Design an enzyme around this catalytic site. Structure first.
Site, PDB file in Angstrom:
ATOM      1  CG  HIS A   1      -0.351   0.211   2.517  1.00 25.39           C
ATOM      2  ND1 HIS A   1      -0.432  -0.728   3.525  1.00 25.39           N
ATOM      3  CD2 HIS A   1       0.263   1.292   3.062  1.00 25.39           C
ATOM      4  CE1 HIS A   1       0.184  -0.273   4.602  1.00 25.39           C
ATOM      5  NE2 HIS A   1       0.608   0.954   4.353  1.00 25.39           N
TER       6      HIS A   1
ATOM      7  N   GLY B   1       3.390   5.979  10.132  1.00 27.69           N
ATOM      8  CA  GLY B   1       4.779   5.918   9.719  1.00 27.69           C
ATOM      9  C   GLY B   1       5.479   4.620  10.064  1.00 27.69           C
TER      10      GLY B   1
ATOM     11  CB  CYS C   1       3.396   0.903   7.253  1.00 25.60           C
ATOM     12  SG  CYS C   1       1.748   0.901   7.856  1.00 25.60           S
TER      13      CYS C   1
HETATM   14  C1  LIG Z   1       1.029   2.550   7.683  1.00 25.94           C
HETATM   15  O1  LIG Z   1       0.565   2.584   6.300  1.00 25.94           O
HETATM   16  C2  LIG Z   1       2.051   3.622   7.823  1.00 25.94           C
HETATM   17  O2  LIG Z   1       2.670   3.730   8.855  1.00 25.94           O
HETATM   18  N1  LIG Z   1       2.198   4.374   6.735  1.00 25.94           N
HETATM   19  C3  LIG Z   1       2.987   5.588   6.713  1.00 25.94           C
HETATM   20  C4  LIG Z   1       2.365   6.666   5.843  1.00 25.94           C
HETATM   21  C5  LIG Z   1      -0.121   2.697   8.687  1.00 25.94           C
HETATM   22  C6  LIG Z   1       0.194   2.305  10.143  1.00 25.94           C
HETATM   23  C7  LIG Z   1      -1.015   2.531  11.064  1.00 25.94           C
HETATM   24  C8  LIG Z   1      -1.259   4.010  11.356  1.00 25.94           C
HETATM   25  C9  LIG Z   1      -1.730   4.063  12.812  1.00 25.94           C
HETATM   26  N2  LIG Z   1      -1.279   2.804  13.389  1.00 25.94           N
HETATM   27  C10 LIG Z   1      -0.866   1.948  12.457  1.00 25.94           C
HETATM   28  O3  LIG Z   1      -0.432   0.826  12.677  1.00 25.94           O
HETATM   29  N3  LIG Z   1      -1.121   1.789   8.169  1.00 25.94           N
HETATM   30  C11 LIG Z   1      -2.192   2.270   7.543  1.00 25.94           C
HETATM   31  O4  LIG Z   1      -2.410   3.470   7.417  1.00 25.94           O
HETATM   32  C12 LIG Z   1      -3.170   1.266   7.022  1.00 25.94           C
HETATM   33  C13 LIG Z   1      -3.179   1.287   5.492  1.00 25.94           C
HETATM   34  C14 LIG Z   1      -4.490   1.979   5.122  1.00 25.94           C
HETATM   35  C15 LIG Z   1      -5.336   2.170   6.374  1.00 25.94           C
HETATM   36  N4  LIG Z   1      -4.486   1.701   7.473  1.00 25.94           N
HETATM   37  C16 LIG Z   1      -4.786   1.636   8.768  1.00 25.94           C
HETATM   38  O5  LIG Z   1      -4.017   1.142   9.606  1.00 25.94           O
HETATM   39  C17 LIG Z   1      -6.144   2.200   9.111  1.00 25.94           C
HETATM   40  N5  LIG Z   1      -6.964   1.193   9.734  1.00 25.94           N
HETATM   41  C18 LIG Z   1      -8.003   0.682   9.074  1.00 25.94           C
HETATM   42  O6  LIG Z   1      -8.463   1.285   8.107  1.00 25.94           O
HETATM   43  N6  LIG Z   1      -8.471  -0.485   9.520  1.00 25.94           N
HETATM   44  C19 LIG Z   1      -9.600  -1.258   8.991  1.00 25.94           C
HETATM   45  C20 LIG Z   1     -10.910  -0.576   9.329  1.00 25.94           C
HETATM   46  C21 LIG Z   1      -9.510  -1.461   7.485  1.00 25.94           C
HETATM   47  C22 LIG Z   1      -9.575  -2.633   9.636  1.00 25.94           C
HETATM   48  C23 LIG Z   1      -6.111   3.482   9.956  1.00 25.94           C
HETATM   49  C24 LIG Z   1      -7.535   3.943  10.255  1.00 25.94           C
HETATM   50  C25 LIG Z   1      -5.435   3.246  11.302  1.00 25.94           C
HETATM   51  C26 LIG Z   1      -5.370   4.569   9.191  1.00 25.94           C
HETATM   52  C27 LIG Z   1      -4.294   0.506   4.771  1.00 25.94           C
HETATM   53  C28 LIG Z   1      -4.938  -0.610   5.591  1.00 25.94           C
HETATM   54  C29 LIG Z   1      -3.908   0.115   3.343  1.00 25.94           C
END
Ligand SMILES: *[C@](O)(C(=O)NCC)[C@H](C[C@@H]1CCNC1=O)NC(=O)[C@@H]1[C@@H]2[C@H](CN1C(=O)[C@@H](NC(=O)NC(C)(C)C)C(C)(C)C)C2(C)C
Ligand SMILES: *[C@](O)(C(=O)NCC)[C@H](C[C@@H]1CCNC1=O)NC(=O)[C@@H]1[C@@H]2[C@H](CN1C(=O)[C@@H](NC(=O)NC(C)(C)C)C(C)(C)C)C2(C)C
Lengths: 302, 302
Positions: B41, B139, B141
């Site tokens: 992603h 951040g 991920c």
């Molecule tokens: C990760 O992509 C990251 O660190 N990216 C840097 C820009 C991030 C880590 C998340 C952020 C808060 N705590 C974490 O562990 N992961 C995501 O943003 C991840 C990516 C998007 C949406 N993501 C989420 O973790 C979201 N959660 C959900 O949407 N969860 C459900 C409802 C689908 C189960 C949130 C809301 C926390 C942004 C994708 C899943 C592709």
């Protein structure tokens, strides 16, 4: 989100660990530049006189292994309870570093080592009674505790000994024991420990930042009246300095420090009633205000 | 003695962390030999079709920073939910390593990272419902979870996402999610979690090795009768395989596995009555039998 007992990344310290062997004693040493630091009780021969014991040693009595590479000692001196071995090679992995003597209540990471090889890393606090509740077996002497700030390793602890209660005592990296302890096998008692109040409050703020709010209440308290309840439960006094340090967390959560004290007071008086906070059924006191902010905001280290 | 939630020394993994930037998205990648692994992603543009999204990218769309050194992508492919970026430089700090898909109940160390820089290390278990209770902010991920065996880093987890309960979901290093989760923003629920019974028993053995004995009793139980009480308290079934794994600990302490089960049964039925075990007022389930033996016997890693 989430909140974990987090240690600093240990790589910068792993690169400094060595084995120091003298006589039948093997323990860990810390190799920074061309000096290896290790506990002085590595030397041969209760109530020893280490000055007498050390004058009797030669450099070649000291076996220093860095991996599969023997380092030769070209000099040695004793500084308090640490021995400093001058070797002919500067450690090329020497990080930027400082030696710091920490205050009780402060936390640090411990890189547990045996025979110069790292075993694991975990987070510790220096208890008010100057012990640490570590995890240390025979052979772990010389393992160090540290913090990392940006790129700098601040060494604050080197392990020496275990007390009969199963807790641990050691020195700063200049060989000064924390607490009243001495490196001889004589009767020594830790001293009555107490709970680190400002840290418990920091951790309640971590809980709020992370969505636990159940322990909050509408009450407030005076610092004076809080400390009266704290003393009754064997908590360290909370000072205005502690209140100020808790300022940033109070501002980010919008909960006044003294209001958080009211919550703690009610938690001390009522217990937790089968509920948990941040995965714990006890009031946790090994997170500093700084720890909470670092982990809840994502500070890194290059 | 002492017993701590111990992480593996993280240095071997610290040397592999990089920043991967594509479009407005920055996250962490894992640089082993000449490949950088990161969550897919990271790519530009709910219900995305990553195959469509990736066919639209060019190598030069991928900004990989290893320290203050930009690595150039010479190829890219997607494997399940991980993206693999071929770069022209092999990581000279590549440790000996394997990719492993772990079972629920198994523990691992997480090296939390932001912008390619390590923030901290902590110990996690894969929960029965295939989430992990981590500590992860935006951040993080691409941060990885791992075990170390002698000299080999076994990578088992890379972080992708946070669930509404504040727990975390991710993949193995071949991009297969643990649990039923998918990397799209659609309604997803973790599943009811349960306590890792064999691990709680391991930790009771750690307590005995370390001098806590207060919870023992003279009773015994049948595996069958134990599991009936376990199910009532939302504990995972204990299998004969678990009993066998607990063999070494049972032999070192002289407490039959089934006798330890009687203690756990009494602890489940009566609670802990204001007492603690190994510093906890809850029954701890994130130590495996192997973790206990490693920490109570001092295994190292070269
Ligand atoms: C990760 O992509 C990251 O660190 N990216 C840097 C820009 C991030 C880590 C998340 C952020 C808060 N705590 C974490 O562990 N992961 C995501 O943003 C991840 C990516 C998007 C949406 N993501 C989420 O973790 C979201 N959660 C959900 O949407 N969860 C459900 C409802 C689908 C189960 C949130 C809301 C926390 C942004 C994708 C899943 C592709
Ligand atoms: C350390 O020297 C080591 O690892 N050496 C490798 C050969 C060892 C670490 C200890 C061992 C168990 N847990 C630990 O943290 N430290 C010592 O052996 C230390 C050295 C001797 C006696 N030491 C002890 O820790 C002893 N404890 C005491 O004697 N404590 C009191 C009564 C003096 C307070 C025990 C009994 C644990 C060996 C000296 C203090 C110089």
């Amino acid at each position: 989100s989430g909140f974990r007992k987090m240690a600093f990344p240990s790589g910068k310290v792993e690169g400094c660990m060595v084995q120091v062997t003298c006589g039948t004693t093997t323990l860990n040493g810390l190799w920074l530049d061309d000096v290896v630091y290790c506990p002085r009780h590595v030397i041969c021969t209760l109530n020893p006189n280490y000055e007498d014991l050390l004058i009797r040693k030669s450099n070649h009595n000291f076996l220093v292994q860095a991996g599969n590479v023997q380092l030769r000692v070209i000099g040695h001196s004793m500084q308090n309870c640490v021995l400093k071995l001058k070797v002919d090679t500067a450690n090329p992995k020497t990080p930027k570093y400082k030696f710091v003597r920490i205050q009780p209540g402060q936390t640090f990471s411990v890189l547990a080592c045996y025979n110069g090889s790292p075993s694991g890393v975990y987070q510790c606090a220096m208890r008010p009674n100057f012990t640490i509740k570590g995890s240390f077996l025979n052979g772990s002497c010389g393992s160090v505790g540290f913090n990392i700030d940006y790129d700098c390793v601040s060494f604050c602890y080197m392990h020496h000994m275990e007390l009969p209660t199963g807790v641990h005592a050691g020195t700063d990296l200049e060989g000064n024991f924390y607490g009243p302890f001495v490196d001889r096998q004589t009767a020594q008692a830790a001293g009555t420990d107490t709970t680190i109040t400002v840290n418990v409050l920091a951790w309640l703020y971590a809980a709020v930042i992370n969505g636990d709010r159940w322990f909050l209440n509408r009450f407030t308290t005076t610092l004076n009246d809080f400390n009266l309840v704290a003393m009754k439960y064997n908590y360290e006094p909370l000072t205005q300095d502690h209140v100020d340090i808790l300022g940033p967390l109070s501002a980010q959560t919008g909960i006044a420090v003294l209001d958080m004290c009211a919550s703690l007071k009610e938690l001390l008086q009522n217990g937790m009633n089968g509920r948990t906070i941040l995965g714990s059924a006890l009031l946790e006191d090994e997170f500093t205000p700084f720890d909470v902010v670092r982990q809840c905001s994502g500070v890194t280290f290059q």
